[PDB]
Write a protein that binds this ligand. Structure first.
Ligand SMILES: Cc1cc2nc3c(=O)[nH]c(=O)nc-3n(C[C@H](O)[C@H](O)[C@H](O)COP(=O)(O)O)c2cc1C
Ligand SMILES: Cc1cc2nc3c(=O)[nH]c(=O)nc-3n(C[C@H](O)[C@H](O)[C@H](O)COP(=O)(O)O)c2cc1C
Ligand SMILES: COC(=O)c1cccc2cc(CCCCc3c(C(=O)O)[nH]c(=O)[nH]c3=O)ccc12
Ligand SMILES: COC(=O)c1cccc2cc(CCCCc3c(C(=O)O)[nH]c(=O)[nH]c3=O)ccc12
Ligand SMILES: C[As](C)(=O)[O-]
Ligand SMILES: C[As](C)(=O)[O-]
Ligand SMILES: C[As](C)(=O)[O-]
Ligand SMILES: C[As](C)(=O)[O-]
Lengths: 314, 314
């Protein structure tokens, strides 16, 4: 307890919290608001080479147990996020991650060669989003393990510097084994963020008898309380499988207790999506106070004392 | 006058509600208790050829948002559930489904060959569980589409009568498309039950810093409030893709409103797992009363007036 500062990836962080990609991070105003917050770090909205308007509205809805979204990758385009990283961000305040989600391997490769020099000069960190649009006859890249191994071979070659990868959840132990083995072929992959939204849920409103988002006939990715045990399982499964990488936890964090659980499961940073969208950036002071209170009550003075130390029975 | 009656698969059901396989259905006492309840049907515990003790305890835990289990297929063996179907079940009370979950294709074929004549004579209905290991280190059967196709070819040939399948949830539209395509190759697959538990979640208790079930280092399938939007998405995705089959909904039903949503999404029968494990069989009269109250408020007199009629935006 006392202070939550930590060191990772050759950067210093005041605390393990940050936003989850896509939440409060699309515009210059959003990035400045996350920088002014008490978060330890921030990450930009996943970007494409060109600006995109994204899907028709309504495209995000939240409820007491979490959220559903089909945003459609609305973003200001890579040139904007690169300019933010290279000219506007104040690195004295906290580290910045830039998320990129190009629609093809070649788009991703082209973005990463342009990011490399700014990464070298300013220390922006890459989070590569291994999620994708629906392509009939094909699964998202992180659910096609040979495709994933390609992206990553090309990005590693094009980029040449340490980066991390945002993963969808898996639900099968054979898939954890295969996915972690792919990631462990790439020494430049230094962190793994588990998880993106739980794909293609469906929220229906009983009174109106209607789905609640317009795109994809109401289907969208789930976040929030629905997904905490899924997120913890993925964090711990990759923590156990990838001893030479860091794991960042994302999914279902509304409280310092939920962050403590992610850290027990193995998380180094803890990302906040739905709860941050719903509460606003004040949440970061509350999460830090709540995490330090649980640490004090247990006698922990550092995150290292309990990271990955979830106990199993027998 | 409003009515919850259904007539499907050559049987008559007083109402759409039944247990989910595995809950309140392992012993003769459990089956007689389900038969005495107000449910419209019941299904037996997934069985294997030989009796199994299942995994060490604790292997099921529940919490306000749902449950986690790694039961390990504990069951009295096929001969016991076939005897209950042949000799003990009172068909004048309600229809019976028998769930089978052999650990290889050959074990499944051996069971269904022996079930067939009792299905024909007594009208017990088969639910084949495809959320079930085959070769260890490979995914569960229904996440391996080639294994799925083989199981269904082999069981269709061996059994020769209408049956249904219990599916795990999917999270990728390409997987909905592929999975429904595989099902639609089999005309004897007349119902599809969506969904089994969401696989390999991990619940951690913050005070003890421990996982809450003993098998698989705490990893287990999730049911209950966590999984309702996932369940609804799978029900509706298979309802849209399998127009010549029925869909039975399972996942996250605690109220008549949750059942109404399943039915809007396309469900015929509605199965209740976690909430029945937690509340007991009195839940069925509460779910019938709650569903009738929503139907009365909306002016609906039968389930067909709204099954599959979820509205999309635009
Ligand atoms: C409105 C919204 C937009 C998101 N956009 C992205 C994104 O651009 N890139 C990405 O990696 N994940 C994105 N996500 C997923 C979140 O980063 C996060 O993985 C997910 O919401 C689970 O965390 P939570 O339970 O805290 O919400 C988005 C989530 C939401 C709710
Ligand atoms: C204790 C337990 C045992 C289960 N055993 C089986 C089983 O034998 N066969 C099966 O198809 N599903 C089994 N399941 C899954 C349930 O049938 C159901 O698909 C899942 O719990 C989701 O429904 P719910 O949200 O109502 O719990 C079991 C679930 C629980 C909680
Ligand atoms: C109906 O068409 C789409 O939804 C779509 C079209 C073209 C590109 C897409 C690209 C995506 C990629 C999603 C990547 C960003 C993201 C989003 C988001 O921007 O929707 N939401 C998340 O929960 N996680 C994410 O990682 C999703 C949908 C589309
Ligand atoms: C420790 O190793 C295991 O978990 C295991 C070992 C041998 C056979 C198994 C068989 C299963 C098969 C699951 C089939 C029944 C079932 C169960 C159950 O009995 O665990 N729970 C569910 O939520 N859904 C189900 O469909 C699961 C685990 C094992
Ligand atoms: C705060 As926004 C509307 O740019 O995510
Ligand atoms: C393990 As203790 C010293 O944190 O009470
Ligand atoms: C009620 As029981 C322990 O036979 O599922
Ligand atoms: C008219 As129909 C319920 O068989 O698709």
């Amino acid at each position: 307890s006392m202070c939550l500062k930590l060191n990772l990836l050759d950067h210093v962080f005041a605390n393990p919290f940050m936003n989850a990609a896509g939440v409060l991070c699309s515009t210059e105003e959003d990035l400045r608001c996350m920088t002014a917050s008490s978060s330890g770090a921030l990450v930009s909205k996943s970007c494409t080479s060109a600006p995109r308007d994204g899907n028709p509205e309504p495209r995000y809805m939240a409820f007491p147990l979490g959220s559903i979204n089909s945003m459609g990758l609305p973003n200001l385009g890579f040139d904007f996020y690169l300019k933010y990283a290279s000219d506007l961000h104040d690195y004295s305040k906290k580290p910045l991650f830039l998320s990129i989600s190009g629609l093809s391997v070649e788009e991703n490769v082209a973005m990463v060669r342009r990011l490399a020099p700014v990464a070298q000069e300013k220390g922006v960190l890459l989070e590569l989003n291994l999620s994708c649009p629906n392509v009939p006859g094909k699964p998202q890249v992180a659910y096609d393990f040979e495709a994933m191994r390609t992206y990553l071979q090309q990005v590693s070659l094009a980029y040449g510097l340490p980066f991390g990868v945002k993963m969808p959840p898996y639900f099968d132990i054979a898939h954890f084994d295969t996915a972690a083995a792919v990631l462990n072929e790439f020494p430049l992959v230094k962190f793994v963020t588990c998880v993106n939204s739980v794909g293609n849920g469906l929220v229906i409103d009983a009174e109106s008898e209607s789905v609640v988002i317009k795109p994809k006939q109401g289907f969208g990715g789930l976040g929030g309380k629905y997904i905490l045990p899924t997120a913890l399982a993925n964090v711990n499964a990759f923590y156990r499988r990838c001893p030479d990488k860091l794991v960042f936890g994302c999914g279902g964090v509304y409280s310092g207790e939920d962050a403590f659980l992610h850290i027990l499961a193995g998380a180094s940073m803890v990302q906040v999506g739905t709860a941050l969208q719903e509460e606003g950036p004040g949440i970061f002071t509350r999460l830090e106070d709540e995490l330090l209170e649980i640490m004090a009550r247990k006698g922990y003075r550092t995150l290292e004392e309990f990271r990955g130390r979830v106990k199993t029975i027998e």
